[PDB]
Amino acid sequence: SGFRKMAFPSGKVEGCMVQVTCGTTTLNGLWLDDVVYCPRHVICTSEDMLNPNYEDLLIRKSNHNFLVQAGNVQLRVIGHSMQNCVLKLKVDTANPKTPKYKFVRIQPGQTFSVLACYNGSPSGVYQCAMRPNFTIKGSFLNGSCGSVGFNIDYDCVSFCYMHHMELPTGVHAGTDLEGNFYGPFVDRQTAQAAGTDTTITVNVLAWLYAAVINGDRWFLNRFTTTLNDFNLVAMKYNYEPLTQDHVDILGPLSAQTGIAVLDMCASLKELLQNGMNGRTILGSALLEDEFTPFDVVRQCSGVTFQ
Amino acid sequence: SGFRKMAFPSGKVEGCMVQVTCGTTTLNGLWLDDVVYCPRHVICTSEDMLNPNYEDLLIRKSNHNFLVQAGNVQLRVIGHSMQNCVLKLKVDTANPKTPKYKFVRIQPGQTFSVLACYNGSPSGVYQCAMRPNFTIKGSFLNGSCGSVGFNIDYDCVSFCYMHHMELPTGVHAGTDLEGNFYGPFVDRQTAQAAGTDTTITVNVLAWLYAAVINGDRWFLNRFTTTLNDFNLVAMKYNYEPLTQDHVDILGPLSAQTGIAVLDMCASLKELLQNGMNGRTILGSALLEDEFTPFDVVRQCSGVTF
Numbered sequence: 232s233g234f235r236k237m238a239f240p241s242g243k244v245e246g247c248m249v250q251v252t253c254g255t256t257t258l259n260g261l262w263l264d265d266v267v268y269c270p271r272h273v274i275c276t277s278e279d280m281l282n283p284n285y286e287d288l289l290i291r292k293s294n295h296n297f298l299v300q301a302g303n304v305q306l307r308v309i310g311h312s313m314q315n316c317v318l319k320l321k322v323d324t325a326n327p328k329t330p331k332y333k334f335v336r337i338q339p340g341q342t343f344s345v346l347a348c349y350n351g352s353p354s355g356v357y358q359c360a361m362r363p364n365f366t367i368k369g370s371f372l373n374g375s376c377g378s379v380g381f382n383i384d385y386d387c388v389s390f391c392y393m394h395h396m397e398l399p400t401g402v403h404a405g406t407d408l409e410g411n412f413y414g415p416f417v418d419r420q421t422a423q424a425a426g427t428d429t430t431i432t433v434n435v436l437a438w439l440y441a442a443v444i445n446g447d448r449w450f451l452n453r454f455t456t457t458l459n460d461f462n463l464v465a466m467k468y469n470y471e472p473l474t475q476d477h478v479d480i481l482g483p484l485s486a487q488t489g490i491a492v493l494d495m496c497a498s499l500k501e502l503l504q505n506g507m508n509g510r511t512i513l514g515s516a517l518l519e520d521e522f523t524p525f526d527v528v529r530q531c532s533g534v535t536f537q
Numbered sequence: 538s539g540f541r542k543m544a545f546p547s548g549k550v551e552g553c554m555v556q557v558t559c560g561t562t563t564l565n566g567l568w569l570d571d572v573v574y575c576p577r578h579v580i581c582t583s584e585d586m587l588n589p590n591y592e593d594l595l596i597r598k599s600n601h602n603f604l605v606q607a608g609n610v611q612l613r614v615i616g617h618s619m620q621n622c623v624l625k626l627k628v629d630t631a632n633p634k635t636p637k638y639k640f641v642r643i644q645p646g647q648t649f650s651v652l653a654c655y656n657g658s659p660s661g662v663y664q665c666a667m668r669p670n671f672t673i674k675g676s677f678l679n680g681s682c683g684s685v686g687f688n689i690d691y692d693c694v695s696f697c698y699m700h701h702m703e704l705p706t707g708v709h710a711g712t713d714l715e716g717n718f719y720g721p722f723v724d725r726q727t728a729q730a731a732g733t734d735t736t737i738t739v740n741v742l743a744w745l746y747a748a749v750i751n752g753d754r755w756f757l758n759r760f761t762t763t764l765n766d767f768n769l770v771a772m773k774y775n776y777e778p779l780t781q782d783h784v785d786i787l788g789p790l791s792a793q794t795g796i797a798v799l800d801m802c803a804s805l806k807e808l809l810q811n812g813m814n815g816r817t818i819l820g821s822a823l824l825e826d827e828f829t830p831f832d833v834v835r836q837c838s839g840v841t842f
């Protein structure tokens with residue numbers, strides 16, 4: 232019993248974190264095999280950030296201008312290249328702690344663990360979701376760039392995020408491990424803003440199923456709804472549209488609890504209209520949207536507390 | 538910017554988790570140097586759990602009855618002994634991944650990271666607090682016993698909790714690494730319950746300071762209070778009493794924000810009496826009490842390990 236915001240054990244990622252320095256700029260790097268991946272803005276000064284010409288800044292750099300530090304050991308940079316917004320530094324030593332890994336690009340609504348790092352040293356681990364507006368509500372200070380997001384399903388680490396910047400509303404933007412940004416963001420200090428965010432409906436439904444599994448049913452009602460009528464209500468509360476894909480995805484949780492997806496949608500419609508009236512669901516007074524259907528299945532018991 | 542429930546990086550603890558099997562019972566063990574620590578109930582059958590005489594159950598076991606597995610390698614048990622509610626299995630190999638460590642017993646209100654494990658394999662990491670009623674609001678299933686709680690102080694892992702059981706309300710009970718339970722619990726299948734819980738006042742105040750540091754200031758007011766008047770109100774709402782030690786502990790956060798501790802206490806009094814009126818603090822409609830003053834300072838400064 233219990234339901235917590237749970238991160239993957241971070242050890243496999245801790246053994247990959249290094250410090251990358253170019254002149255006066257220092258940030259974090261991810262060392263996998265003989266390559267160190269890091270944000271390309273490590274070659275920029277604060278003045279370059281308004282309209283940087285990365286190709287022009289990079290061509291003036293040699294391998295020996297990049298200082299990579301792994302623990303207390305200096306790695307030797309033997310090559311460099313840029314791939315989108317990421318810099319790939321070829322080093323003379325393969326990481327002996329390199330886990331089994333893949334680079335995966337995630338979709339909005341998907342969750343991941345973040346290992347926040349400073350100066351190549353891990354400081355903390357927390358759970359995050361890719362918001363529908365392609366930002367993440369992380370906890371990062373100056374020096375955290377190059378910190379990564381990942382999932383570890385079945386002992387293989389799937390790296391999905393590298394941290395690049397904080398927007399004016401305090402939310403965060405970054406790229407996949409191929410340097411492609413999530414959202415319409417650029418690694419430029421030009422005026423940028425997070426778009427209006429919405430609630431991840433499929434995740435709130437998954438979390439309502441987690442509460443039924445753990446033994447709570449107070450929020451259920453005798454009603455059902457159509458998918459279209461549910462979406463007309465959801466969008467009035469700034470909730471993302473629920474698609475047939477989301478309904479299909481919620482199938483296993485629906486079978487385990489015996490509550491049809493559109494019946495759970497009717498409960499969600501009622502919760503949005505009435506609020507909680509002093510009650511909580513899994514220790515929360517707000518409807519949680521940062522647990523996916525997959526996260527609920529992973530954490531919750533396979534036996535519903537009927 | 539941003540404020541998340543953050544755990545310590547778990548790698549140093551991951552390298553210590555092993556699987557311990559005694560007959561049909563399998564649970565987790567902590568392998569430090571040449572000793573594997575685990576809950577002593579690993580030696581009980583379901584019937585034994587009703588009224589166990591652990592010394593009598595243990596005397597009937599030999600070293601080979603304990604199967605310890607580290608990854609895909611079997612560890613050879615060369616000795617065994619009991620210390621309170623923990624079983625210490627002496628093995629023939631010292632853990633090459635043993636970090637610098639200490640066993641520490643924590644007080645209610647203190648937070649720690651839990652590395653939830655099943656079959657000796659880590660599955661997740663989360664942050665939680667020792668409740669004033671000595672239980673923890675964890676997330677554990679059958680097979681999680683022997684999972685540990687810890688904090689990191691520079692390079693040293695301070696182990697503070699080992700998981701033993703789940704109470705009827707779904708909350709959890711366990712021991713320090715010396716086998717002494719937190720709370721009036723026993724490792725027996727008998728009628729036991731979590732007592733009435735209270736809110737950790739010093740932690741709520743720390744989290745209000747974290748919110749101010751992050752730009753959430755709507756709850757601040759021109760008023761102040763005395764410590765005694767605040768405690769009379771806090772008692773009415775099932776909040777733990779605030780002591781002069783708690784006030785001293787909140788000093789740095791008070792200096793950084795310019796909001797005196799008793800000034801923040803007046804803000805907390807108004808929130809208890811009136812609620813939030815449709816507003817949230819750090820994305821929460823409830824007053825959060827699982828962040829200590831130290832956790833707030835650490836997350837708002839980026840302390841590394």
Ligand SMILES: CNC(=O)C1(N2C[C@]3(CCN(c4cncc5ccccc45)C3=O)c3cc(Cl)ccc3C2=O)CC1
Pocket residue numbers: 272280371372373374375376395396397398417418419420538
């Ligand atoms: C909040 N940002 C800023 O004040 C500044 N900034 C800097 C930066 C790099 C570091 N960094 C941060 C990343 N995460 C958290 C942070 C917290 C507090 C300060 C900075 C942080 C950035 O955002 C950056 C990178 C890129 Cl690719 C594009 C633009 C910027 C940028 O705007 C200084 C001007």
Ligand SMILES: CNC(=O)C1(N2C[C@]3(CCN(c4cncc5ccccc45)C3=O)c3cc(Cl)ccc3C2=O)CC1
Pocket residue numbers: 232578586677678679680681682701702703704723724725726727
């Ligand atoms: C909820 N518990 C139970 O139904 C049972 N139980 C078993 C147990 C050992 C495992 N375990 C659990 C530990 N954390 C989470 C759990 C989730 C779901 C089932 C069990 C869990 C226990 O509590 C145990 C240990 C001790 Cl030292 C004292 C008594 C018990 C005990 O009562 C079965 C009867």
Ligand SMILES: [Cl-]
Pocket residue numbers: 336337338341
């Ligand atoms: Cl995805």
